[PDB]
Amino acid sequence: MQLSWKDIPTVAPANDLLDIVLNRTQRKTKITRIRAFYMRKVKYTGEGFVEKFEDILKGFPNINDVHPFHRDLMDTLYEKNHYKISLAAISRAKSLVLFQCKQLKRAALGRMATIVKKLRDPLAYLEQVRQHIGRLPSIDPNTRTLLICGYPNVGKSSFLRCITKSDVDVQPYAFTTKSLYVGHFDYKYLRFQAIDTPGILMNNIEMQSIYAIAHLRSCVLYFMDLSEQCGFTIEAQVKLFHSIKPLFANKSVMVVINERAQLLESVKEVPGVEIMTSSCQLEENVMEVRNKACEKLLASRTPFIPESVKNLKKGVFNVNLKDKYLLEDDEWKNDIMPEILDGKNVYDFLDPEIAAKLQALEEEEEKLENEGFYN
Amino acid sequence: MRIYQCHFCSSPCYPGHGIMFVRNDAKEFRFCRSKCHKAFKQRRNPRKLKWTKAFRKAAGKELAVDSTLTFAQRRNVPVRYNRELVATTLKAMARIEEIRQKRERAFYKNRMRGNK
Amino acid sequence: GHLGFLPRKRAASIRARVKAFPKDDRSKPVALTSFLGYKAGMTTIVRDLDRPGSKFHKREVVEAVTVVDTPPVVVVGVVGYVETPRGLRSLTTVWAEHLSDEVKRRFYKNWYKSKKKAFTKYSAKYAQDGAGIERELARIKKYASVVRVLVHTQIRKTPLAQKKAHLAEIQLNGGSISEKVDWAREHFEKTVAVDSVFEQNEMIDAIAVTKGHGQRGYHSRTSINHKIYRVGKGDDEANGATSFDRTKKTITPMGGFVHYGEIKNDFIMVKGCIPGNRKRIVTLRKSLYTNTSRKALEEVSLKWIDTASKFGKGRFQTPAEKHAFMGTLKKDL
Amino acid sequence: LPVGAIMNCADNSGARNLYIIAVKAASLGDMVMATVKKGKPELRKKVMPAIVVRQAKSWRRRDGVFLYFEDNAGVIANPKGEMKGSAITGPVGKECADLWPRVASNSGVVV
Amino acid sequence: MATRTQFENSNEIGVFSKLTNTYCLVAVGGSENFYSAFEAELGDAIPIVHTTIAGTRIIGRMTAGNRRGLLVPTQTTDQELQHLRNSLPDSVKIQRVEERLSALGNVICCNDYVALVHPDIDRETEELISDVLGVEVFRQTISGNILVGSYCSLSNQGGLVHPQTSVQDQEELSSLLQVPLVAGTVNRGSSVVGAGMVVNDYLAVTGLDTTAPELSVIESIFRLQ
RNA sequence: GCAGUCGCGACAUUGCUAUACCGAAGCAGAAUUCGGUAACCCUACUGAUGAAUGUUACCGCAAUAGUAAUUGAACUUAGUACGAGAGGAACAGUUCAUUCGGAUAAUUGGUUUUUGCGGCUGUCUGAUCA
Ligand SMILES: [Zn+2]
């Protein structure tokens, strides 16, 4: 399924849904006649609830079936057990459904209303989760994914904003983003998607990025700083990198860096990592790193032309082709051609230099009389 | 606009009259009237039918080939729209038509051997 | 059917009458609001389609048109209508005094026995120094500013057996009703031709009485948004000619129209099939509202007009074609 | 063609006859949904869209001519006009040719 | 060099237009962008005749001619022939052809020196094409394809053919034509390259839906740069 | 429904048992949802005659009664705003298609008592046209 959901049915509060159903059933209207009318009224009520519950179930994706990464992300954003309990409650609500006839109809209507009201908490949770799940990032694991990771935003968000047009916050405060930010682009006629990490130092924000990196095939770029930026110490950054190495080294790792030289170069112990020194504001090394990252994923009777062409540099109203079609002179450009004469097409008896043909008449006219046809 | 010669009769037919038949062979089976169309469908071959120019010319009832008819060629190329050509065609077409009309009676008289 | 066209009672008269007139402006010059004619059959036309943005733009199209004989229409009087809290009232009517035998026959139901004394004493008021007509005209000038002119057709010119003329009221769109009445004074007893009012490609509406089918049919009906294709006149040589075919032939087909005479006089060719059968009198109003649609604003260039015989199935277009194709015949030799 | 009728086909695909199940009456260039019985499993027993290329009934083209074709034939294609057949036998009407460029492109003879 | 255009939100450039080294032909339409693109790409270089053939919008599939001559189909009316003669200069010959299979645009694919013709073509028509256009007669069916005029597009610098063309057939045809040939899709997988695009010695026109790999392949084969 | 929490005990409370036009919803676009304007019988039916307006006729007005047009498709504006991408508006003017209504037979056509033509047949004339 496409990783962008907007058809998920909206979840209204329990009271609002009950009122809507009651109004709809009220609008869509002897002993046997009374009983039949009351039974029809009772029947028409639960159909709406069943249809709405089925639509909600269909719209809401299954957490444990779509993908392991999607399951992990859904669990991190919202309690997975709570979501499953809400789905189970929705299923249970869907599956549960003169004077005596009126009392029975009231009993059925009130039972449905009470079920809906008790469903308010699961409905409230469903609405809240729907209001955030729909516009979730359109991550495609099967595509060519490049991940940007590291400590909080040092300015590396600018690199992603430049490689892909997807605008991303680049404010340098403690934690820029709180979710995955993805941006598509093209390289060598091949589609690529760059995903940014809000920051790795647990917290759900960092856990989401860690799970995405672990469960999604990608080529990863870890960011560090040699200058005063990023706040955190180079030693702390190196320790975090080493601690994360066991489950992250195999992800096509590159290093971008915005006794100091020895400490920074000591990170070269990892075999497959290539380190590049650049900055968030320069252009030369930024473009070099962009090209290197783009290449890393893949690494892991002669013709006749008129001379005038080379010199060239660049329905409410009808348009006339006069002055567009060519003739010997502009004065007689009008199409006064009759094209029909005495029931015979002009072209059927129109030829050039027909004056010579006209000469034959001088003898053909005499042939009318002197040939013996009539006289 | 174009006036088409009837396949069954060779007479002129104007747009908006009759019905044309388009066979799988993609040929213009145009006819002046439903009578001619149905005759063609029934295969009342015009060359064997008395009342068609196709039979008349072949059998000599009317002039078969003449200068007045040879000039009616289906030209493969157009002309550059010269007024002198239009004037000459206007001058010549009426005289050619009159000559052909007279030669029709001439051929009738020639065929009339025995009573002429 | 639609309730608007009910009840299904027979039309009051064969000569349908216009029930509404175009809005008038007090600044534009004098101009007639409507004309009349007789439907002299129908024909087929082929013309180019220069309409832009059309699926068949710049291509050729074929359609059916109705021909209406519209001989010169001669004025006989003018009437003033005063507005009141009870509608319009005919305040005064003044006639040209030159009433023809046709209008006399129209007024007399059994003319063949009538003494033909109509309009004899009234002629005295005009056949002298008068000034009564001048007084009436001044009365009209001071009074109501809406004026209608009575006219009748030259039925004798039209090839019809009725022989009786018909009276019709036409409004004038000229401002300063003093000018309207002054123009009527100079045009009294005069005949107006077709080309005076209408123009080519103009959008109009028509009113007539439909053919009866046995009650079935025989009701007054109006068809709106009809485009005028041609306005031919008897003095105009080759009324049936066009720019392309330019054949020197009249719109009258081989053998003339079926159930109608061979029209050789003024006529109008318009889009569509105006209601009414052959020999039926129809009226043409000039677009009570000035529609600015591209359909109305577009012009038409006639390519060719069908002239083959209508009775039966046309074999040729003009008499010259049949004998030319035949060559010779026992009927000739 | 009347609704629900059985007609022939003119495409060079693995289908020879069509049986209308829905219409989107019928005429030249009209699109219908139909199944195939005379043919091969590639198209037989499955519903597919078809476009009529011949009418067999007289009609007045806007160009000013009354014409009619010989036999009623169609061509199988998707709703967007992606005709499977690389070629079409027999003539194809101008109305359908202008409406479906692919049909005109793959048509051996037009009008 | 390669320009992307559309007609009525369609990529059937080869159906709605035709191009040659000395002139271009386009169909009737209300969209001014279609004419503007051709004017910008060619402008004063060559005339752009805005006209129909036989009153159809498939002028692209109806026309069949080169810079040397134009062999219009049978359906071309006398008025259309006269208009084409007026629009085109006397340097380009124009002639009508009487054919039972007169869909010339699809039947015949030709360039300034060679004319690929569907074997269904008649000997008289092939000889007329060779004489008027001064091109060789190439009775060929590219990898079994029937409509060469629709499934191929030949320029003097290179040729484009449908993707299913066999390597051996491509090599043989390229050797015969003395110019390179490449098999590739157009308009995002459209196999009818002739109907989907047109090309000449210096200009290539494709649909707005052409993918980047298809555009790159087209540019590489035609070597416009 | 029963029970309970709050001298009779008001709302809360817990246990089981079609389209079009508006404001909004986290309305990026499209699409979607919510609340409103709400879509052999009486009277008969209809066509039509009709004692009397000083006579007939023409031109007319209108009190009153009926009323209608509806749905869909393409261009422009658009592959533009919008949008990580997939996808994708609308207004302004044009060009078309279906249902319904009012009219026509210029062409075509289902259909003939041109009660028209020529051949044939039934039958039958001085035998043979018929
Ligand atoms: Zn005939």
**Could you give the C-alpha distances from E84 to A50, A340, B38, E58, E178, in angstroms and in order?**
69, 19, 38, 16, 32
CB of C87 nearer than 7 A to strand F: yes
H/E element, E97: none
CA–CA distance, A17 with C314 (Å, rounded to integer): 75
H/E element, B97: helix B83-111
Cβ contacts of D51 within 8 Å, gap of 6 or more: D29, D30, D31, D74, D75, D77, D81, D83, D96, D100, D103
Q: Could you count the other beta carbons within 10 Å of the beta carbon of residue C320? A: 16
Q: Are D9 and D15 in contact (CB under 8 A)?
A: yes
Q: Are C16 and C283 in contact (CB under 8 A)?
A: yes
Q: Are D90 and D54 in contact (CB under 8 A)?
A: yes
Please provide the DSSP assignment of A20-72 as one string.
HHHHHHHH---HHHHHHHHHHHHHHHHHHHHHHHHHHHHHSPPHHHH-HHHHH
Chains that touch D (3 or more CB pairs under 8 A): B, C, E
Give the nearest chain D residue to C60 (CA atoms).
Answer: D63
Domain over C72-192 is classified CATH 3.30.1430.10: yes
CB of B17 nearer than 7 A to strand F: yes
* CB-CB under 8 Å, E156 with A326: no
CB of C293 nearer than 7 A to strand F: yes
Tell me which residue in A186, A303, A326 faces E86 most closely, judged by beta carbons.
A326
CB of C80 nearer than 7 A to strand F: no
CA angle A58, A63, A64 (to 5 degrees): 120
Domain of E13?
Answer: 1-225
H/E element, B104: helix B83-111
State the smallest CA–CA distance between residue C46 and chain E in angstroms: 15
CA–CA distance, E12 with E23 (Å, rounded to integer): 19
Cβ contacts of D8 within 8 Å, gap of 6 or more: D16, D17, D18, D71, D72, D73, D74
Q: Could you count the other beta carbons within 10 Å of the beta carbon of residue E70? A: 26
Report cis status (omega within 30 of 0) of the bond before C7: yes
Give the nearest chain B residue to D110 (CA atoms).
Answer: B26
Q: Are E109 and E153 in contact (CB under 8 A)?
A: yes
Residue A135: strand, helix, or coil: coil
Q: Could you count the other beta carbons within 10 Å of the beta carbon of residue A373? A: 16
* CB-CB under 8 Å, E194 with D108: no
Residue A245: strand, helix, or coil: helix
CB of C314 nearer than 7 A to strand F: yes
**Distance, angstroms, CA A44 to C1' F18?**
22
What backbone torsions phi and psi does residue A148 show, to the nearest 5 degrees?
-110, 125
Q: Ligand 1 mean position to C328 CA, how many Å?
A: 19
Q: Which residues surround ligand 1, an ion (CB under 5 A)?
A: B 6, 8-9, 31-32, 36
Domain over C6-71+193-210+217-331 is classified CATH 3.40.50.970: no
**Distance, angstroms, CA C163 to C1' F122?**
54
Residue A256: strand, helix, or coil: strand
**Distance, angstroms, CA A375 to C1' F129?**
38
The count of structural domains within chain E is 1
CA–CA distance, A290 with A284 (Å, rounded to integer): 10
- CATH number assigned to the domain comprising residue D18: 2.40.150.20
Q: Are B29 and B40 in contact (CB under 8 A)?
A: yes
Resolution (A): 3.9
Tell me which residue in C306, C324, C326 faces B97 most closely, judged by beta carbons.
C324
Residue A345: strand, helix, or coil: strand
| Nucleotide whose C1' lies closest to the alpha carbon of residue A19 | F34
CA–CA distance, A335 with E150 (Å, rounded to integer): 35
State the smallest CA–CA distance between residue B27 and chain A in angstroms: 20
* CB-CB under 8 Å, E16 with D106: no
Residue C7: exposed, middle, or buried by beta-carbon count in 10 A (0-12, 13-18, 19+)?
exposed
- Neighbour-count burial for C302-313, b at 16+ CB within 10 Å, e otherwise: bbbbbbbbbeee
Residue E192 contacts D where some CB pair is shorter than 8 Å = yes
The residue with tokens 């088409």 is B4
CA angle C305, C306, C308 (to 5 degrees): 150
Looking at this protein, which amino acid is placed at residue A95?
A: S
CA–CA distance, A34 with A39 (Å, rounded to integer): 9
Q: Are A254 and A221 in contact (CB under 8 A)?
A: yes
CA–CA distance, A56 with A90 (Å, rounded to integer): 9
Annotated domain spans of chain B: 2-65, 66-116
Cα end-to-end distance, chain B, whole Å: 43
Evaluate whether chains D and A are touching (3 or more beta carbon pairs less than 8 Å apart): no
Residue B62 contacts C where some CB pair is shorter than 8 Å = yes
CA–CA distance, C3 with D61 (Å, rounded to integer): 36
CA–CA distance, E34 with E57 (Å, rounded to integer): 14
Tokens of E204: 């290539």
State the smallest CA–CA distance between residue B85 and chain E in angstroms: 15
Nearest CA to A196 out of A152, A135, A258 is that of A152
Cβ contacts of A357 within 8 Å, gap of 6 or more: A351, B71, B92
Please provide the DSSP assignment of C146-158 as one string.
EEEEEEEE-TTTS
What backbone torsions phi and psi does residue A172 show, to the nearest 5 degrees?
-90, 15
Nearest 10 degrees: CA dihedral of D47, D51, D52, D53? -140
Tell me which residue in B83, B89, B103 faces A349 most closely, judged by beta carbons.
B89
The count of structural domains within chain D is 1
CA–CA distance, C5 with E107 (Å, rounded to integer): 58
Looking at this protein, which amino acid is placed at residue A172?
A: P
Tokens of D104: 């005109």
Beta-strand (E) ranges in B31-116? none
Residue C285: strand, helix, or coil: strand
CA–CA distance, A120 with A108 (Å, rounded to integer): 19
Cβ contacts of E139 within 8 Å, gap of 6 or more: E117, E118, E119, E121, E126
Residue B67 contacts C where some CB pair is shorter than 8 Å = no
The residue with tokens 């107006």 is C192
* CB-CB under 8 Å, E100 with D110: no
H/E element, A159: helix A157-163
Looking at this protein, which amino acid is placed at residue D87?
A: A
Annotated domain spans of chain C: 6-71+193-210+217-331, 72-192
Give the method used. cryo-EM
CA–CA distance, B68 with E212 (Å, rounded to integer): 64
CB of A227 nearer than 7 A to strand F: no
CA C324 to the chain's CA centroid: 37
State the smallest CA–CA distance between residue C55 and chain E in angstroms: 9
* CB-CB under 8 Å, E81 with B78: yes
CA–CA distance, E185 with E163 (Å, rounded to integer): 6
Q: What is the DSSP secondary structure assignment for residue A267, as one 8-state letter?
A: G
Looking at this protein, which amino acid is placed at residue A258?
A: N
Tokens of C243: 């720019």
Cβ contacts of A32 within 8 Å, gap of 6 or more: none
Residue pairs spanning A and E at CB distance below 8 A: 61
Residue C273: strand, helix, or coil: coil
Q: Are C250 and C317 in contact (CB under 8 A)?
A: no
CA–CA distance, C163 with A71 (Å, rounded to integer): 98
State the smallest CA–CA distance between residue C324 and chain B in angstroms: 6
CB of C214 nearer than 7 A to strand F: no
CA–CA distance, E126 with C238 (Å, rounded to integer): 48
Residue C242: strand, helix, or coil: coil
Looking at this protein, which amino acid is placed at residue E124?
A: E
The residue with tokens 């062979």 is B25
Nearest CA to E122 out of E154, E97, E142 is that of E97
Beta-strand (E) ranges in chain A? 144-150, 181-187, 190-196, 219-224, 253-257, 275-277, 340-341, 344-345
Q: What is the DSSP secondary structure assignment for residue A365, as one 8-state letter?
A: H
- In the 7-36 segment of chain C, residues within 7 Å (Cβ) of strand F are 7-10, 13, 15, 17, 19
What backbone torsions phi and psi does residue C82 show, to the nearest 5 degrees?
-100, 135
* CB-CB under 8 Å, E201 with A314: no
Residues of chain C positioned with their CB less than 8 A from the CB of D94: none
Residues in chain C: 333
CA–CA distance, D43 with C77 (Å, rounded to integer): 80
Q: Ligand 1 mean position to E103 CA, how many Å?
A: 29
Q: Ligand 1 mean position to B46 CA, how many Å?
A: 9
Domain of D29?
Answer: 1-111
A152 marked ligand binding residue: yes
- CATH number assigned to the domain comprising residue E162: 3.75.10.10
Residue C272: strand, helix, or coil: strand
Nearest CA to A318 out of E29, B112, C165 is that of E29
| Alpha carbons within 13 A on the beta-carbon side of A340 | 21
Nearest CA to B33 out of B57, B50, B9 is that of B9
Residue E35 contacts A where some CB pair is shorter than 8 Å = no
